[PDB]
DNA sequence: ATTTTGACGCT
DNA sequence: AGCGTCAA
């Protein structure tokens, strides 16, 4: 009753760029704008692998991971932009730099947690408190929320036939119901959060040209889920009260962290399909099947409650470079292995030197990882060494030294299907 | 031959 | 420390 926490203490947003790498390339090349477009890496093997797809191309069925030759079978007029290749490998610098543009804009509004190259969480609790104080009892106009959806609305009792009509009808129902007079109202706090996110998204688009979607809720899992509900170029508010109906038909795998083996086990062991069905288990039952940590997390999450903080971290914690060597291209000679370690180490050196100048820090550990032909696991072996000098020849030599005894017997066997260098354990400089 | 990353958990 | 999970 009066003591049941409801996980309504925070306002959290997740901002995710729409078809991000495609938009970077469309900004650079106006010929690609408003077209079915994709970004591809490599070209010789089946036209290259698609890693990003414009919404116009998705309408034809083009997806991430498709070979470009096959995408062309679905979408003959598909336009393609190629990832830069340097030193024999795909080089993602352009997208990392565009990411920095967006992150630097978002951080003007609030503390952000960089969650991936194109998305960040925002803890808006303090900003909402401030805006509620400058704005005192003044109602919030629908004009302040021109691209916001209220999940679950409209409900109940003809513009309803088109999607913008429905959006406005749901928003009107929501705002009509709001009580602006209580500064402690969670629903009001979320609404002010959404106003701020509209401002943030407008700033991102104005200052970079890039469009994005966003979720606004009380925690990161719900913000992330909300964000995906009305992509692209829209934002979605998931209130605490919307959770029971939303979760009643939500496949377990759609919640972040449950998309893999753990989610599959939740489905298989409990014989359920949707997140809401989890409410019928005690915390102890869930802990018994999935462990203390997972059990408690699931017990709270299925009720819309999660406490994971927005971490104050705008910069990546590691800087890595990897290359796969599939099928017949697997590395089978000592010289091959050393040459590719050098290529990787040279890209890594460039990125580390820039990072040291920009961010006043230095990496102190080098992690070397390899995969052997036949092993399905991403990494077959991982070994570390000291990272004491930003020198590509030294880093590549040290990596060879730490992995050379994996070679069973001038020849390398079994052939290597992946090399990976990662700089870790940063200290201030 | 789904590539190139990145964060965090378990022991 | 080294491996495993999940993710974009
Ligand atoms: N498996 C993968 N491998 C390589 N790059 C990937 C990737 N998944 C994503 N990327 C890269 C390429 C992507 O552009 C970028 C962001 O990933 P998203 O946010 O998952 N997808 P996007 O922004 O394209 O579309 P929208 O969000 O509107 O659905 O990260
Ligand atoms: Mg995105
Ligand atoms: Mg994303």
DSSP 3-state of A414: strand
Which residues neighbour A412 within 8 Å (Cβ) at sequence distance 6 or greater? A331, A332, A333, A334, A336, A337
DSSP strand E in A25-134: where? Answer: 37-41, 49-53, 79-82, 85-86, 89-90, 112-116, 119-123
Nearest nucleotide to the CA of A384, by C1', is C1
Q: Which of A241, A195, A246, A245 is nearest to A216 (CA)?
A: A195
Calpha distance A219→A216 (Å, rounded): 8
Nearest nucleotide to the CA of A116, by C1', is C8
Name the structure determination technique. Answer: X-ray
Rounded to the nearest angstrom, the gap between the alpha carbon of residue A185 and the centroid of all alpha carbons in its chain is 30
The residue written with tokens 């949707």 in the block is A274
Calpha distance A299→A88 (Å, rounded): 48
Breaks in chain A (C to N > 2.5 A) come right after: 157, 409
The Cα-based distances of A371 to A81, A231, A401, A418 in angstroms read 29, 37, 16, 5
Rounded to the nearest angstrom, the gap between the alpha carbon of residue A126 and the centroid of all alpha carbons in its chain is 24
Confirm if A80 and A68 have CB atoms less than 8 A apart: yes
Resolution in A: 1.8
State which of A15, A19, A201 you would mutate to test the pocket of ligand 1, scoring each by most atoms of that ligand within 8 A of its C-beta.
A19
| Nearby residues for ligand 2 (ion, Cβ within 5 Å) | A 16-17, 20, 118
Nucleotide B1 C1' to residue A327 CA (A): 6
* Structure token pair of residue A316: 């990546």
CB atoms within 10 A of CB A306: 20
DSSP strand E in A117-266: where? Answer: 119-123, 148-150, 212-217, 235-237
Confirm if A237 and A190 have CB atoms less than 8 A apart: yes
Rounded to the nearest angstrom, the gap between the alpha carbon of residue A79 and the centroid of all alpha carbons in its chain is 25
Calpha distance A339→A118 (Å, rounded): 32
Calpha distance A110→A159 (Å, rounded): 37
Report domain extents, chain A: 1-18+89-251, 19-88, 252-309, 310-429
Q: Which of A98, A80, A88 is nearest to A40 (CA)?
A: A80
Which residues neighbour A291 within 8 Å (Cβ) at sequence distance 6 or greater? none
State which of A14, A15, A17, A116 you would mutate to test the pocket of ligand 1, scoring each by most atoms of that ligand within 8 A of its C-beta.
A17
């Amino acid at each position: 009753g009066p003591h049941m926490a409801t996980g309504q203490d925070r306002v959290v947003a997740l901002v995710d760029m729409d078809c991000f790498f495609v938009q970077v390339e469309q900004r650079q090349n106006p010929h690609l704008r408003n077209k079915p477009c994709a970004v591809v890496q490599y070209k010789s093997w089946k036209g290259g692998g698609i890693i990003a797809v414009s919404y116009e191309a998705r309408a034809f069925g083009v997806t991430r991971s498709m070979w470009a030759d096959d995408a062309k079978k679905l979408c003959p007029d598909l336009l393609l932009a190629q990832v830069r290749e340097s030193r024999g490998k795909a080089n993602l610098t352009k997208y990392r730099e565009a990411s920095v543009e967006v992150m630097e804009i978002m951080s003007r509004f609030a503390v952000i947690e960089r969650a991936a190259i194109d998305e960040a969480y925002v803890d808006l609790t303090s900003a909402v408190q401030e805006r509620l104080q400058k704005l005192q009892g003044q109602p919030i106009s629908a004009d302040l929320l021109p691209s916001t959806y209220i999940e679950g609305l409209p409900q109940g009792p003809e513009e309803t036939v088109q999607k913008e009509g429905m959006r406005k009808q749901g928003l009107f129902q929501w705002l009509d119901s709001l009580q602006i007079d209580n500064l402690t109202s969670p629903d009001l706090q979320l609404t002010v959060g959404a106003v701020i996110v509209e401002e943030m998204r407008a700033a991102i688009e104005r200052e970079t040209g890039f469009q994005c979607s966003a979720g606004i809720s009380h925690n990161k899992v719900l913000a992330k889920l909300a964000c995906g509900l009305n992509k692209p170029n829209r934002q979605t508010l998931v209130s605490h009260g919307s959770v029971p109906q939303l979760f009643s038909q939500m496949p377990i795998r759609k919640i972040r962290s449950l998309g893999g083996k753990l989610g599959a086990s939740v489905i298989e062991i409990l014989g359920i399909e949707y997140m809401g069905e989890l409410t019928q288990f005690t915390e102890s039952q869930l802990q018994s099947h999935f462990g203390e940590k997972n059990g408690s997390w699931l017990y709270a999450m299925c009720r819309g409650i999660e406490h994971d903080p927005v971490k104050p971290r705008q910069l990546p914690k590691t800087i890595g470079c990897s290359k796969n060597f599939p099928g017949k291209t697997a590395l089978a000679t000592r010289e091959q292995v050393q040459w590719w370690l050098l290529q990787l180490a040279q890209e890594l050196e460039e990125r580390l030197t820039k990072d040291r100048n920009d961010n006043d820090r230095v990496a102190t550990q080098l992690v070397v990882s390899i995969r052997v032909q036949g092993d399905k696991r991403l990494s077959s072996l991982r070994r570390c060494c000291a990272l004491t000098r930003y020198d590509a020849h030294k880093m590549s030599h040290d990596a060879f030294t730490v992995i050379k005894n994996c070679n069973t017997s001038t020849e390398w066997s079994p052939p290597l299907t992946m090399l990976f260098l990662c700089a870790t354990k940063f200290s201030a400089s």
